[PDB]
Design a protein around this ligand. Sequence first.
Ligand SMILES: Cc1ccc(C(=O)O)c(N)c1
Ligand SMILES: Cc1ccc(C(=O)O)c(N)c1
Lengths: 340, 344
Amino acid sequence: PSWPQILGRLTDNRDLARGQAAWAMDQIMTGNARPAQIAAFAVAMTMKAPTADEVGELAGVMLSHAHPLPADTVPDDAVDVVGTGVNTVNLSTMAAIVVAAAGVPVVKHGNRAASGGADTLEALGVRIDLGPDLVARSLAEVGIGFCFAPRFHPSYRHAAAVRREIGVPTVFNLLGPLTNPARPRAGLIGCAFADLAEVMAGVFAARRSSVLVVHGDDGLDELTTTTTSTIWRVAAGSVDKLTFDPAGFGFARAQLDQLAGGDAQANAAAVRAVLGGARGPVRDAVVLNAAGAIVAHAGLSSRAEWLPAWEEGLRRASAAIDTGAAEQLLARWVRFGRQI
Amino acid sequence: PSWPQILGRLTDNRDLARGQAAWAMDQIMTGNARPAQIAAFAVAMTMKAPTADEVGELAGVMLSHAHPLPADTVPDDAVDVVGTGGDGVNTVNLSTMAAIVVAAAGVPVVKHGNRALSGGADTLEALGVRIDLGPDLVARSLAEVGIGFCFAPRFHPSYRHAAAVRREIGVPTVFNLLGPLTNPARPRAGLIGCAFADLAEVMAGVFAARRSSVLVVHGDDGLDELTTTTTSTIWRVAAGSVDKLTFDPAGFGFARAQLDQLAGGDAQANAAAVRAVLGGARGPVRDAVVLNAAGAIVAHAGLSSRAEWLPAWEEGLRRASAAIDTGAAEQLLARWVRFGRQIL
Ligand SMILES: Cc1ccc(C(=O)O)c(N)c1
Ligand SMILES: Cc1ccc(C(=O)O)c(N)c1
């Protein structure tokens, strides 16, 4: 195997042979790929259009170089809440907090902005750069933790530099959600693009995860309140693609602009406001996505069906805000950081 | 204008806005493009599929960075004989031979290339020709011999950043088209061979915008030359319009040949094949060389005449044959080698 062969096959617009994406990612993670090869590969795979099998090899190779959390310290039922990345408020970060406040372990995964989720969390007082043991204590003691991507994926630094140098979105942009070092088996995963969402869903299905890959039919990388969303429901090795409509649960149609963010600070303030009871479109979307994650989580253990699960989901997410549990959980998480 | 803007547009399978490819190429030529950026651009332009306007921007910016040939030193009617290479076939240097034959028929020839089995430049050196010369001397060679060679790394030094990336990734890209389009002597006619029929119509397009008289040719068996093994596709560029054609050498009495009968080797081998043909040896190689020489002569005729196709090929083929059988072609190679040896 070699770059000219792998690159050639991609520009000839052919799917790779089994193991070629893996070999390419390995070269990249070991510092043996030149930046030009890295770039050529990311672009060529983006424009050929990666298959689920190919993306699975990239993510699995990436994980095999990651720092793990200490074994037997992430619950069997932890969930991730995360988009692939419209200058909006950090709906995922808020949802994550709400999900944790409703009783469900959450472990998120991220970096400082490409206000990114990580920046907002820092702007809220949360310590984002913790090692595996403290991330694990965060889970046990607060019910949520955050894995800072560069501490857990140090070998990804060559690819990271190339991604900044070229700017453009590529296949690499899919790996965040698939390389959460805590390896939760459940999640709600937001995707800007419908074609790539199906691929993403294929990768999760081969992991036997219980996940909802979500794409707003307005292009939002979360469940939206402005229109329908497409959900790829993933469980027990298979995919149930469907059209989801939140009007069915009584959510008013909102405007895309009503969900708009700003600096880390603006987004921190939006979080403090929603968690403190402010009604509105932002809350509506936060609750919608929190319920989504709660439903995914239910996929791991419960036999419960789609609609009843969505209903429990919504009531739990609502109640976690209204009872102050979310606001209280955030304060507890902050405390935890300061008590080293 | 930026890399995110330009690359994002290409990955979305869109043609670029005017000026974008030129900005890119400018960054690349001035040292300001990071290797990753050069690679990303090359690959994305390839997979999107470039337009003639995009490639004309790349080429024109590259030319603006080249060393000049001195004024009034290139005849109004010089021709190039050149292929994109990369056919993957490893044949004898058919272009180098045709170029010698063409110059021997009285058509001034100005080639342009690099080293690579064995490239045009490498074979030229194996024959004793000095390929590494400054523009004064290339101009002088043209005037005193009837042919010159522009060594690409000497005329396009600023292309060095692009050339390193090309080597690191090793895969054919849009940059593989630029050689024929950045000949520093700016011949207005040529016979341009293309490995890939897709990009040939694009290549024809750029020459058409230049108002050149060019035959862009592709062997229907994958050769970047006119072929004797089967038919060829030709894009005739004249008066600013392209025109696609199927050409069949059997219509001038050429036997079908076998691809391995045109097989190359190291610089010593290809040099011995040149010697044999120029010396009068008959066979598939000679045939191939005469065919492609005539094509270049037909392209040259297109400059100062609107002569008919079949007679143009008939004069073309008789002048190439004669050029060899009179000994002119052999003599001209000797003249070229002697000229280099006088430089001191
Ligand atoms: C996921 C990720 C993102 C960025 C870097 C980095 O080094 O900048 C990294 N090492 C890992
Ligand atoms: C056309 C060309 C090819 C290669 C190089 C190089 O620097 O190696 C160059 N400077 C110009």
